[PDB]
Amino acid sequence: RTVARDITLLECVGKGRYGEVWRGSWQGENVAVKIFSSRDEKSWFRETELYNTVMLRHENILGFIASDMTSRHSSTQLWLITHYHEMGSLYDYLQLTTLDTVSCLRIVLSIASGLAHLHIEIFGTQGKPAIAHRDLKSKNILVKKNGQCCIADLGLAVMHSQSTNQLDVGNNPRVGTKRYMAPEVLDETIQVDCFDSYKRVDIWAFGLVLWEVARRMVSNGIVEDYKPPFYDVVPNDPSFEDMRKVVCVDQQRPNIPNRWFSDPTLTSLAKLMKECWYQNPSARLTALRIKKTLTKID
Numbered sequence: 623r624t625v626a627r628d629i630t631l632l633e634c635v636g637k638g639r640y641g642e643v644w645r646g647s648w649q650g651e652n653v654a655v656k657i658f659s660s661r662d663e664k665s666w667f668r669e670t671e672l673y674n675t676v677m678l679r680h681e682n683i684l685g686f687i688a689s690d691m692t693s694r695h696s697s698t699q700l701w702l703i704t705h706y707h708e709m710g711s712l713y714d715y716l717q718l719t720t721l722d723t724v725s726c727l728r729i730v731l732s733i734a735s736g737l738a739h740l741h742i743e744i745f746g747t748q749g750k751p752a753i754a755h756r757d758l759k760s761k762n763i764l765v766k767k768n769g770q771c772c773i774a775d776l777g778l779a780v781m782h783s784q785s786t787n788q789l790d791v792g793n794n795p796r797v798g799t800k801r802y803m804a805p806e807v808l809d810e811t812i813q814v815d816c817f818d819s820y821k822r823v824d825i826w827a828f829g830l831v832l833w834e835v836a837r838r839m840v841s842n843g844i845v846e847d848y849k850p851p852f853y854d855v856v857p858n859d860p861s862f863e864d865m866r867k868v869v870c871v872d873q874q875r876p877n878i879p880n881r882w883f884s885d886p887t888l889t890s891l892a893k894l895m896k897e898c899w900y901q902n903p904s905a906r907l908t909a910l911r912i913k914k915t916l917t918k919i920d
């Protein structure tokens with residue numbers, strides 16, 4: 623039904639090394655079109671495999687519509703068409719508004735539910751495998767109209783099945799975002815032949831996103847400005863060694879504002895992120911435990 627040639631590219635909502643994301647019109651309705659850059663072709667392939675072959679579908683994962691190739695300007699462009707969320711990314715959303723207690727917990731529980739869906743394998747005939755994301759950040763999370771979020775960008779995902787015990791890391795030249803890089807990645811101790819290692823990298827990045835969101839929830843008339851993780855120690859577009867010095871050498875973690883300790887929700891959230899930030903990867907919580915704890919927090 624939905625084909626690239628029938629979509630009208632209205633305006634560019636994002637550009638970068640990955641390529642571009644456009645707001646498009648298809649049959650009147652709004653759609654999101656990611657035109658992958660030439661350098662990021664392998665990410666389009668892996669994402670197409672997950673959405674089409676694995677048929678990944680969850681309410682807290684960016685709703686896939688159609689994959690497509692289009693020949694334009696004497697070149698073949700790789701397209702990904704998904705649902706369009708007019709609120710933009712959580713990165714944009716956090717800078718535009720503050721959150722109450724319910725809106726903040728709704729955001730982080732929806733992300734945990736999405737991550738738990740990826741990590742947990744459904745067994746049996748045609749059962750979906752376990753998936754690790756490996757590039758979780760606030761720019762890769764979109765805010766829906768009901769206050770919930772969905773996880774986006776599967777170009778780096780790795781897959782694992784328990785029965786066969788096969789790990790599928792693909793061969794993508796893409797590296798994760800350096801700002802959200804887990805310490806075992808920065809010092810090259812991560813066991814690349816073990817699937818659990820990739821889940822624990824997501825948990826680290828999740829903890830960073832949890833910090834970004836909770837800063838924006840107001841308690842007792844106090845709220846922090848939006849800031850990216852490690853905003854105070856690394857520069858814009860931080861280097862691999864910049865992050866190594868902060869996260870590995872100095873063992874630093876995002877600061878917990880003192881005002882958080884006079885609010886029961888932010889205090890429980892602060893404990894939650896620190897349990898996502900252990901230098902020892904095997905000590906961090908699982909996505910399911912995070913989802914359960916976030917379900918119980920008031």
Ligand SMILES: COc1cc(-c2cncc3c2CN(C)Cc2cc(N4CCNCC4)ccc2-3)cc(OC)c1OC
Binds near residue numbers: 710
């Ligand atoms: C981050 O991964 C993707 C995301 C989207 C997507 C979905 N729904 C809304 C937006 C986006 C794109 N991203 C850049 C956030 C965003 C931002 C804005 N803006 C308003 C104007 N000022 C700047 C911010 C508008 C729309 C979106 C689409 C994708 O595939 C088609 C993605 O790939 C897997």
